[PDB]
UniProtKB/Swiss-Prot annotation:
The gene is Grik2. Sumoylation mediates kainate receptor-mediated endocytosis and regulates synaptic transmission. Sumoylation is enhanced by PIAS3 and desumoylated by SENP1. Ubiquitinated. Ubiquitination regulates the GRIK2 levels at the synapse by leading kainate receptor degradation through proteasome. Highest expression is found in the olfactory lobe, piriform cortex, dentate gyrus, hippocampus, granular cell layer of the cerebellum, and in caudate-putamen. This is Glutamate receptor ionotropic, kainate 2. The postsynaptic actions of Glu are mediated by a variety of receptors that are named according to their selective agonists. This receptor binds domoate > kainate > quisqualate > glutamate. It does not bind AMPA without coexpression with GRIK5. Homotetramer and heterotetramer with GRIK5. Tetramers may be formed by the dimerization of dimers. Assembles into a kainate-gated homomeric channel that does not bind AMPA. Can form functional heteromeric receptors with GRIK4 and GRIK5. Can form functional heteromeric receptors with GRIK3. Interacts with DLG4. Interacts with NETO2. Interacts (via C-terminus) with KLHL17 (via kelch repeats); the interaction targets GRIK2 for degradation via ubiquitin-proteasome pathway. Ionotropic glutamate receptor that functions as a cation-permeable ligand-gated ion channel, gated by L-glutamate and the glutamatergic agonist kainic acid. L-glutamate acts as an excitatory neurotransmitter at many synapses in the central nervous system. Binding of the excitatory neurotransmitter L-glutamate induces a conformation change, leading to the opening of the cation channel, and thereby converts the chemical signal to an electrical impulse. The receptor then desensitizes rapidly and enters a transient inactive state, characterized by the presence of bound agonist. Glycans are attached at N1, N8.
């Protein structure tokens, strides 16, 4: 239950925008916050969250 173990833990992740791991989100209208990104590391961080 590592899903239940880390609640109430707002964490801050930084990254570098050069990779195919993170190269924003492909859409006509830009989103904001964590939802404006996509890639290997972004959906990987969504999987880990
Ligand atoms: C986040 O905070 C809430 C506050 O309600 C926690 O909920 C309680 O968590 C404890 C265990 O830490 C349980 O024993 C209680 O039954 C829960 N409810 C009550 C009555 O508060 C929640 O678990 C916390 N989440 C974390 C820290 O991961
Ligand atoms: C996590 O907790 C849930 C309770 O809803 C339980 O069903 C599940 O088996 C737990 N996960 C592990 C790996 O024990």
């Amino acid at each position: 239950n590592i899903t239940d173990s880390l609640s109430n833990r707002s964490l801050i992740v930084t990254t570098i925008l050069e990779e195919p791991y993170v190269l924003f989100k492909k859409s006509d209208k830009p989103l904001y916050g964590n939802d404006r990104f996509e890639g290997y590391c972004i959906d990987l961080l969504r999987e880990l969250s």
